[model samples]
Target: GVRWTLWDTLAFLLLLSLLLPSLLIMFIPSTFKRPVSSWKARNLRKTLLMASSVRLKPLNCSRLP
Candidate 1:
């Protein structure tokens, strides 16, 4: 018997979404979405520079006003 495709389409889409992440688990050491600590530290230093520039710029403007 031919069935409706409503569940069929949903099942495939969900399968693809889940399967992609499962592939990451097999490819990487962690199943969780944990990333590298070094990468985060690299971005952390970038944010420090950005915050310093923001506070420095505001200090000069505040002195005038």
Candidate 2:
């Protein structure tokens, strides 16, 4: 009469159990992971400026301004 079988219940529990460790980490502040910063704001702007400077060379363009 019910839609769920015992095996279906076990499968659901197994899938839900997989998320427990990640959820546990949320409660443990000391073990929390921090986001790593790869590039700084100034460095990104400098890199873009450097790239644009190279492209600004006259021979690098197809047409003259």
Candidate 3:
């Protein structure tokens, strides 16, 4: 049988977390909408930087934060 590794777990969790917000918006009313452009841009920049800075090694995880 195929095995599930830490990377696979992380990927699955990340996928669910990313999808949860959009799923909520679908079920919630528009009245709860808020202005998040600044925060979104800032987080986007952080995410991009973090993604670009990833340094992977066999059996190891590295992060810059």
Candidate 4:
């Protein structure tokens, strides 16, 4: 006589059934994903380095003895 009220049990079961399909769809991976090369990512690093070098050059000396 202490189990969840009938309405609560039905609502929980309904929500779980609705969510199960979505979870399975996400867990099954498709075949189209691929890894990209490092060469493609190096351009952003180089651009940031170039910008910092020019901006920092005025406030800090690189040739200090």
Candidate 5:
């Protein structure tokens, strides 16, 4: 007779009864229910290349001579 009582037994019984449905209910409450673009890349690459082109024009004079 190591700790016998209806409350404890009933609690476990209720837990066993409701475990799956409880988990389902627990999961049911919105648990599992959980802009880059190519044009910008092309556009930005063009812009970046044009940006480098001006810098490259000047840097090339110094780098060559």
Candidate 6:
């Protein structure tokens, strides 16, 4: 078995044959009905700090409240 990239996933849909019908099962209404209020776009900030631990520095705010 092989893993597919997001690009590959999209391309597979374009072909004549349908992709796994099971993937559709992931779209059950109960799944999407949940609100995303708890999530934040913090991946970029976290990943940057983790991948470059101790090597990179964070910017400091020069102005104070």
Name the best candidate (by TM-score): 2
TM, every model: 0.31, 0.37, 0.35, 0.34, 0.28, 0.21
lDDT of 3 by residue, 1-65 (tens): 65379998898889999999978887876655754777789989999998899686676668977
Q: On lDDT, who's better, 1 or 6?
A: 1
lDDT of each: 0.74, 0.70, 0.82, 0.72, 0.69, 0.63
lDDT per residue (tens digit) for residues 8-62 in model 4? 8888889999999978767666542332465556877898788888443346458
Alpha-carbon lDDT of model 5:
0.69
Reference-based lDDT, residue 40, model 1: 83
- Candidate 5 lDDT at 60 equals 38
> 1 or 6: which has the higher TM-score?
1
Residue 31 alpha-carbon offset, candidate 5, angstroms = 30
Query: Which 10 residues in a row give candidate 4 its minimum summed lDDT?
Result: 31-40
Ten consecutive residues with minimal summed lDDT in candidate 3? 29-38
What's the true lDDT of residue 8 in model 1? 86
Worst 10 residues of 6 by lDDT: 33-42
In the range 1-65, model 5's lDDT, one tens digit per residue, is 65499898988888888786756666564533332466669889999988877543333344534
TM-score ranking from best candidate downward: 2, 3, 4, 1, 5, 6
Deviating ranges (above 4 Å) for candidate 1: 1-26, 31-34, 54-65
Which model, 4 or 6, shows the larger TM-score?
4
What's the alpha carbon RMSD for model 2?
A: 7.5
Model 6 stretches with alpha carbons more than 4 Å out: 1-40, 55-65
**Clash count, candidate 1:** 0
